């Protein structure tokens, strides 16, 4: 796809069998999803956004489908205003910015 930016670049994702909406976010180093259950152990992470730093749960090697594209990588879980797909998974699906 070639996605223009007149609207939010929202796509459907699938994680743990569940469809969710998420924003493709070139401004995010990391993928951050709202509270949900994920398998395995997690490790601590602090991430800094516009308003300050927060604690999140870091899960590694999570299978996620993004707009029909398969990715396997790190997902952060915490109080984000919207689910965000960051560069760690945008690279896996081959996304680029073009102008």
Ligand X SMILES: CC(C)CN(C[C@@H](O)[C@H](Cc1ccccc1)NC(=O)O[C@H]1CO[C@H]2OCC[C@H]21)S(=O)(=O)c1ccc(N)cc1
- Which residues form the interface with its own copies (CB under 8 A)? 1-6, 8-9, 23-29, 32, 47-54, 67, 69, 78-81, 84, 87, 90-91, 93-99
Task: Note whether 86 and 35 are within 8 A (CB).
Answer: no
Task: Say if residues 93 and 47 touch (Cβ distance below 8 Å).
Answer: no
Which residues contact Cl ion (rule: CB under 5 A)?
A: 4
Query: Residues binding ligand X: what is the number (CB under 6 A)?
Result: 15
Least distance from Na ion to the Cβ atom of residue 71, Å: 14
The answer to whether 74 and 91 have CB atoms below 8 angstroms apart is no
* DSSP single-letter state for residue 39: S
Residues 45 to 64: which contact ligand X by CB under 6 A?
47-50
Which residue of the chain is nearest ligand X when measured via CB? 49
Q: Which two tokens stand for residue 74?
A: 């790190």
């Amino acid at each position: 796809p070639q996605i223009t930016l007149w609207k939010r670049p929202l796509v459907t994702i699938k994680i743990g069998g569940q469809l969710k909406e998420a924003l493709l976010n070139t401004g995010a180093d990391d993928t951050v999803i709202e509270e949900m259950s994920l398998p395995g152990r997690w490790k601590p992470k602090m991430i800094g956004g516009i308003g300050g730093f927060i604690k999140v749960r870091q899960y590694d090697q999570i299978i996620i489908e993004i707009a029909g594209h398969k990715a396997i990588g790190t997902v952060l879980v915490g109080p984000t205003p919207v689910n965000i797909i960051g560069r760690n998974l945008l690279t896996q699906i081959g996304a680029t910015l073009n102008f």
